[PDB]
Each structure stands twice: as C-alpha cells, then as structure tokens.
Design an enzyme around this catalytic site. Structure first.
Site, PDB file in Angstrom:
ATOM      1  N   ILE A   1       0.895  -1.141   0.000  1.00 23.14           N
ATOM      2  CA  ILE A   1       0.000   0.000   0.000  1.00 23.14           C
ATOM      3  C   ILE A   1       0.951   1.212   0.000  1.00 23.14           C
ATOM      4  O   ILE A   1       1.957   1.217   0.708  1.00 23.14           O
ATOM      5  CB  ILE A   1      -0.930  -0.075   1.247  1.00 23.14           C
ATOM      6  CG1 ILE A   1      -2.066  -1.063   0.943  1.00 23.14           C
ATOM      7  CG2 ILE A   1      -1.465   1.303   1.618  1.00 23.14           C
ATOM      8  CD1 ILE A   1      -2.514  -1.904   2.112  1.00 23.14           C
TER       9      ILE A   1
ATOM     10  N   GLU B   1      -2.271  -8.912   2.766  1.00 26.31           N
ATOM     11  CA  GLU B   1      -1.893 -10.201   3.351  1.00 26.31           C
ATOM     12  C   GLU B   1      -2.885 -11.314   3.032  1.00 26.31           C
ATOM     13  O   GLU B   1      -2.497 -12.463   2.887  1.00 26.31           O
ATOM     14  CB  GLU B   1      -1.735 -10.075   4.868  1.00 26.31           C
ATOM     15  CG  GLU B   1      -0.719  -9.030   5.288  1.00 26.31           C
ATOM     16  CD  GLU B   1       0.679  -9.383   4.851  1.00 26.31           C
ATOM     17  OE1 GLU B   1       0.829 -10.352   4.075  1.00 26.31           O
ATOM     18  OE2 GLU B   1       1.626  -8.692   5.285  1.00 26.31           O
TER      19      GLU B   1
ATOM     20  N   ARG C   1      -2.257 -12.523  -0.594  1.00 30.40           N
ATOM     21  CA  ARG C   1      -1.055 -13.365  -0.670  1.00 30.40           C
ATOM     22  C   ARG C   1      -1.195 -14.758  -0.082  1.00 30.40           C
ATOM     23  O   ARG C   1      -0.493 -15.674  -0.505  1.00 30.40           O
ATOM     24  CB  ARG C   1       0.105 -12.683   0.050  1.00 30.40           C
ATOM     25  CG  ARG C   1       0.399 -11.301  -0.420  1.00 30.40           C
ATOM     26  CD  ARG C   1       1.412 -10.670   0.487  1.00 30.40           C
ATOM     27  NE  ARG C   1       1.891  -9.421  -0.075  1.00 30.40           N
ATOM     28  CZ  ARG C   1       2.173  -8.339   0.641  1.00 30.40           C
ATOM     29  NH1 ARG C   1       2.021  -8.348   1.960  1.00 30.40           N
ATOM     30  NH2 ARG C   1       2.618  -7.246   0.035  1.00 30.40           N
TER      31      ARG C   1
HETATM   32  C1  LIG Z   1       2.864  -5.522   4.063  1.00 22.94           C
HETATM   33  N1  LIG Z   1       3.911  -4.456   3.827  1.00 22.94           N
HETATM   34  C2  LIG Z   1       5.235  -4.636   4.149  1.00 22.94           C
HETATM   35  N2  LIG Z   1       5.986  -3.506   3.842  1.00 22.94           N
HETATM   36  C3  LIG Z   1       5.111  -2.582   3.320  1.00 22.94           C
HETATM   37  N3  LIG Z   1       5.383  -1.271   2.860  1.00 22.94           N
HETATM   38  C4  LIG Z   1       4.310  -0.485   2.352  1.00 22.94           C
HETATM   39  N4  LIG Z   1       4.573   0.791   1.892  1.00 22.94           N
HETATM   40  N5  LIG Z   1       2.988  -1.030   2.329  1.00 22.94           N
HETATM   41  C5  LIG Z   1       2.689  -2.340   2.779  1.00 22.94           C
HETATM   42  O1  LIG Z   1       1.366  -2.753   2.712  1.00 22.94           O
HETATM   43  C6  LIG Z   1       3.798  -3.149   3.322  1.00 22.94           C
END
Ligand SMILES: Cn1cnc2nc(N)[nH]c(=O)c21
Ligand SMILES: *[C@@H]1O[C@H](CO)[C@@H](O[C@@H]2O[C@H](CO)[C@@H](O)[C@H](O)[C@H]2NC(C)=O)[C@H](O)[C@H]1NC(C)=O
Length: 246
Positions: free
Chosen positions: A71, A160, A163
C-alpha cells in the site's frame, strides 16, 4: 479498480473481493502454478486503486503497487496521504493528483515502523471485517497515531489476505467478530519474501528449496518447509514476489 463494501458484507462477498484483488494483479508466468508478480511496471500502470466503503457508505481509495502489493497511500475526500518513503513518493506522481492537499505520514509503511507509531505490536491488534470498518472510519479524519493502527488492520485484511489463502480464511472467520491474529498468520506475513524467493530457487532444483523456511503452524509448533510439495506451497500462498525485488 476493485471495490469492497462492508455494508452487507458476509464471508462470501469478502472472498469475492479478495479474488478480484488477486486477478487485478498482472503476471506473465506462473511458477509451480502460482502467479509470479512482475519485476517492474512503467508509469501509472504500476498502481491499483481500491475503493473501500465502510458500513455507513463513506469511502477511501487505496493505491496499491502491483509488483509487490504494498500500500503506498490513500485518498480521503480531498486529501491524499502517502507513506514517508521513496516508493510512496514516486507513487504520488501518478495517483490522487486532483487532491487539494497531500500529506506525508510521519513513518514509512513497513510493519516495524507502523507498530512503533501505533504503540502496539500487531499481535495485540484485533482484525476482521468489523475492524476494517473502523479502520476506514479512522482514516477519513487524520490522526497519525490512529492511522498507524488502522493501516496495520487495512494492510492485513487486504494485501496479506491476497497473498495467503490461510489469512483470507482467518478473516472470513472474523466477519462479525474481531480477533487478534494467530502466530501462524504473523509468521506467514513475515515469510512472504523468503518463501517467494525459495519457491523460485526450486525451479531448477527439482522443487527442493535451497534454504529451508521456518514458520509456526495452526497449533503454534515450529515447522520447516523444505520443498514445494508442502501445503503452504500447494494450497496457501497465492502470489510470488519476483526475486528481482528482494
Ligand atoms: C505488508 N507491507 C510490508 N511492507 C510494506 N510497505 C508499504 N509501503 N505497504 C505495505 O502494505 C507493506
Ligand atoms: C518434502 O516435504 C514433505 C512434507 O510435505 C516431506 O514429507 C515427509 O513425508 C511425510 C509427508 O510427506 C512427512 O510428514 C514426513 O515428516 C517426511 N519424512 C521425510 C521423508 O523426511 C518430504 O520428506 C520432503 N521431501 C523432500 C525434502 O524432498
């Protein structure tokens, strides 16, 4: 674009939204039957927009990076909010441009940083569809501390779940009642990268992992995954982060 309305949502409609989300992500090849995400994509085609509606009908549009499912930021009425990190900043140039003001959140979007700003680890934050409704509600009106918590719920009930089949199933059980996540869930969330890499390294190695991956299971017992015949590979994981990104 993909849309989900919490009003009238049941386990079935959620399942359909998550299926839609998966199908919204491009891929040219499958590895051991699982969609391999693209290495990189050019311009505005790199972002997917999610329209989420809370029970009362209010909405926020979330921008997701299609090469990883991360995101990047979101839009509430006329203010855009982006994470404080390079990729997010890059993303601000193609989405939510018609927004009146753009705010950069005081933290980047990785779990470690979000858990600090939120004041609690995600082990203790309840998730589910009711919580998604709250999350959306909380993001409509700025509050960096509250947003951290809401984003941890949003990232998990969408990205999540996309995935991992297991995590989508966990959320369907929490359709009318929130519950903190099981350690299996946390474990999976944390291994997406490793598993993604190892399933790809097994392609010219008879389906055997170069390095075993360690998770915690349903019961909370430490388990080792050494090969693609495992349930995690045959039935859990649904998307693979391309190694060119690791
Ligand atoms: C799950 N996740 C791990 N690092 C992340 N970094 C961003 N910017 N957005 C995410 O949803 C994310
Ligand atoms: C690959 O993983 C499977 C598990 O899915 C390993 O399975 C062995 O056989 C049963 C069921 O498959 C397991 O419960 C046993 O504990 C395993 N015994 C062995 C042979 O260690 C299988 O061994 C693995 N195969 C590899 C490493 O190629």
């Amino acid at each position: 674009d993909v849309s989900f309305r919490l009003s009238g949502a049941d386990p079935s409609s959620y399942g359909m939204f998550i299926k839609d989300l998966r199908n919204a992500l491009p891929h040219t090849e499958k590895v051991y039957n699982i969609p391999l995400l693209l290495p990189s994509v050019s311009g505005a085609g790199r972002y997917l927009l999610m329209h989420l509606f809370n029970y009362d009908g209010n909405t926020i549009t979330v921008a997701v990076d299609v090469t990883n499912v991360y995101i990047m930021g979101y839009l509430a009425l006329t203010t855009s909010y982006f994470f404080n990190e390079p990729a997010a900043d890059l993303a601000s140039q193609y989405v939510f441009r018609s927004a009146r003001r753009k705010i950069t959140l005081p933290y980047s979007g990785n779990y470690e940083r979000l858990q600090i700003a939120a004041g609690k680890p995600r082990e203790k934050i309840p998730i589910g569809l009711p919580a998604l409704d709250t999350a959306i509600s909380t993001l409509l009106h700025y509050d960096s501390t509250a947003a951290a918590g809401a984003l941890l719920v949003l990232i998990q009930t969408t990205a999540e779940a996309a995935r991992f089949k297991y995590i989508e199933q966990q959320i369907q059980e929490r359709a009318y009642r929130d519950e903190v996540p099981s350690s299996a869930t946390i474990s999976l969330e944390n291994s997406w990268s490793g598993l993604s890499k190892q399933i790809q390294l097994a392609q010219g190695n008879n389906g055997v992992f170069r390095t075993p991956t360690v998770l915690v299971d349903s019961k909370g017992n430490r388990v080792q995954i050494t090969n693609v015949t495992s349930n995690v590979v045959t039935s859990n994981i649904q998307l693979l982060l391309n190694t060119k990104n690791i």
